[PDB]
From TrEMBL, chains A, B:
It comes from Pandalus borealis. The keyword Metal-binding applies. Zn(2+) 1 binds at residues 37, 86, 315, 356-357. Keywords: Cell membrane, Glycoprotein, GPI-anchor, Hydrolase, Lipoprotein, Magnesium, Membrane, Metal-binding, Zinc. Pfam families: Alk_phosphatase. GO terms for molecular function: alkaline phosphatase activity; metal ion binding. Coiled coil: none annotated. This is Alkaline phosphatase. Glycans are attached at residue 114. The gene is sap. It is a lipid-anchor; GPI-anchor.
Amino acid sequence: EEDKAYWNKDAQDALDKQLGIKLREKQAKNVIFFLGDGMSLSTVTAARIYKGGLTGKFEREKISWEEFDFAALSKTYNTDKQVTDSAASATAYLTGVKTNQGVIGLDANTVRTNCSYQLDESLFTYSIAHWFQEAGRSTGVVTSTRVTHATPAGTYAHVADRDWENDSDVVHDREDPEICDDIAEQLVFREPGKNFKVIMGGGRRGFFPEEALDIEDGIPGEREDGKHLITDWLDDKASQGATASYVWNRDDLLAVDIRNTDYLMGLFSYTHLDTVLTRDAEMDPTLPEMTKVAIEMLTKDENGFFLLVEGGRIDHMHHANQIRQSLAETLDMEEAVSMALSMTDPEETIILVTADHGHTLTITGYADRNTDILDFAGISDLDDRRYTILDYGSGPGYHITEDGKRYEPTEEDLKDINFRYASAAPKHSVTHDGTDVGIWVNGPFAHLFTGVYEENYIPHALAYAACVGTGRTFCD
Amino acid sequence: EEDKAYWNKDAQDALDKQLGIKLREKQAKNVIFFLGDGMSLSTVTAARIYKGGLTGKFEREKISWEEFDFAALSKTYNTDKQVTDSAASATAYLTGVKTNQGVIGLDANTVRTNCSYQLDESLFTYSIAHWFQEAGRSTGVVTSTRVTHATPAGTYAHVADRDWENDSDVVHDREDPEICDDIAEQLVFREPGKNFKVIMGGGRRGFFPEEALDIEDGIPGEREDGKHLITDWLDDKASQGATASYVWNRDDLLAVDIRNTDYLMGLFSYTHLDTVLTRDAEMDPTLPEMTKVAIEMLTKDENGFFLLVEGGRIDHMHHANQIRQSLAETLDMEEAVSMALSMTDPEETIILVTADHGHTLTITGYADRNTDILDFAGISDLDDRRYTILDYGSGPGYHITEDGKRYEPTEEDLKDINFRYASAAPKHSVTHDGTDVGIWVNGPFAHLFTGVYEENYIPHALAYAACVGTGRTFCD
Ligand SMILES: *[C@@H]1O[C@H](CO)[C@@H](O)[C@H](O)[C@H]1NC(C)=O
Ligand SMILES: *[C@@H]1O[C@H](CO)[C@@H](O)[C@H](O)[C@H]1NC(C)=O
Ligand SMILES: [Mg+2]
Ligand SMILES: [Mg+2]
Ligand SMILES: [Zn+2]
Ligand SMILES: [Zn+2]
Ligand SMILES: [Zn+2]
Ligand SMILES: [Zn+2]
């Protein structure tokens, strides 16, 4: 059992592992950046125990990226808010500069929602993908969200409001769609987006007009400027003499001819991809399946590549206080990191996992070891009503019953994938959490991540190791 | 302002600092171990912003131990509970073995509250203070809690229930005080406690009987066996030919003759010491003042020393959801680390800061940069009532008004040092939180703390760097 000799051997071994660490002081060829949107340290702990429940190891289970020797903390406050949104944080960890709430790829001079600031080049921050391209290397993005959402957008767009995913969004804010480029336009017509070898995720809707109908669903598009950006993208690649493929389901993705495909656009939903627990496994590729194909394509570039993979709906599930779903999203991303580890060489590939910000998830006491993380924890000594292990500081989970008592979750509630666990402060969408988030790194220069950093440090460190961009460099 | 150039220089400097790290691969002569009881990562972030509010730096401020280059994460589950108490965690991080809820210094064979198990030497786990003693080096302990409380007790005691601080506690559990040694007894009559050079904190009550009255307050003691343990402690020291001092107030501590004093017992309260915001600064020494004298005493040992300093009422305040007091307790500990750093030599002294377990504190959005961390964050779009930036997943803060609405905190509330910030799940005493906690380290072999570790790894790593104990060692 877990007795004295057991823990002592457990510690001495972790000690041996730690004394056996070999530093990797060699250039990074490849960088694969995983981003769990909203993935607080409490999400990671709870997901570890959730995973353990599936495997039978329970609290002793390990999350794949926790096998890395280097972890660090990341401070996420931005230029105007203590609790950052997904846009300003992406600008920090992908372009190296902190910024204002709702702004992508522009500095804190920006006034949110005012398109004029996205016309001023001096205010532009440039992404690590931009740097990889400037260096003659390939770039790609994979996400479970719309490919125009804040996180992926951070690798290529410069907009004064992250809501401006397509031209209908710009118009909704009374800005001029003729001069205010939306994110979907930027991905297809401007750098670095137009040079991405791989683009996968959701958001077909932002790429074709109201007059046209969606592949698969036949839902009218959102564009109001008549542009058919997917065909524009396909034509552009063809006119360059390259082979390009556009796919929208799992079988077609898996059937892609990797050796002969130069460019791959895979858009698997009109909107964000379906969540792990609701998706049709036949029609939707999983995060690890996208990750795999992406790596397969990008690794043809012998000079190296940068790929962003986002576990994006972790955040959306937490916003609704839908903790069961949030944990399943998280593990989809944990399995993708394992996919990436198994396919690449650590003497040449940095795998970095982080979060853009947290969520107000907490893990309360005092359930026994091996208890399902999503179960009840006990009964309250104040109102004699049950409470769950997991709960939140903010969100719609807060519930005063008709007779003015605290809602008591039931056993049916716990199993319901749409059940909202309790919060302390009611809100229609839970707020993000301002606590520092984790960073975990493996590969070349993984030891540049030991302490506590400003979130914007990340890419500057990554550029040093990869030898890209205009800052201090390993090759320098 | 915080524009593009600003953030880029910020990151390049942090990068320069990182590339300048020099490893310390030399033996540790000294080990100073700071333990923030219940000091979750969210507590550290919130305390960082709280400190900034005092210094005018706000979210840009840095906690002293955040200047260290090495941080790591610690997994705190124990052998029977997902969310650990202070007793089992202390056993883990001070003796290197995880154990059952409520148990100190025995392994998981122990059945809580069954004294028989504390009679079986084969189930004993030994503390890093024991190991320093065995190596001919000095040891001490400083805390804001009773000196018999779980945390300090982890350095010396072996009991089947952490409630057994004095004999009256043992009797209350129907165990035999004659053969079931309470914690206060063990500190004075058994090793390693009898050999500590320094003992500071509170809890005089556990050391003298009901028939006797407290120095200072004249409160009858708790002991029911007539023992006067302080005079037993003094007499033991004198009969060894050593000088000893017993002090109970700040003036007297500060007046202690350091060069001529071999042993120091400073007990400043009948019970736990008063909280930072309620203490009488003339009568009670601060956590940094204790730390200073402790180091002054223990550094006379040319062979080295181990010192535990606990910021212990962080936890007690969180239990009541009293967040304002928790943050002041935390900063008292932050200032002690600065005191320790300003007095010792990093080529020879490890300073490690960690928590035993967290608390369910969250940092909600969306207040502006520079907003007082303890202020309101905004108004709920569900019930049109204010909510605070800080709140908890568990505790007595949950409050449904008489008319069945969500209590609305007032401006008066926020300034009241006894006001209980809102929780999501009502409980008389908030539960601890199961989320991983931080570790931050400086000095020799600080680079043994880089990733993610079981909480019991800590002392094994510390022993290696200090060359103590029976495990793998740097001197080996
Ligand atoms: C948007 O910014 C421009 C550019 O300086 C300014 O002239 C204009 O009035 C701003 N709009 C608003 C609504 O503040
Ligand atoms: C306590 O432990 C002893 C020692 O093995 C055992 O004989 C005794 O019955 C136990 N007491 C309880 C309450 O189980
Ligand atoms: Mg996202
Ligand atoms: Mg304690
Ligand atoms: Zn986000
Ligand atoms: Zn969000
Ligand atoms: Zn504790
Ligand atoms: Zn506690």
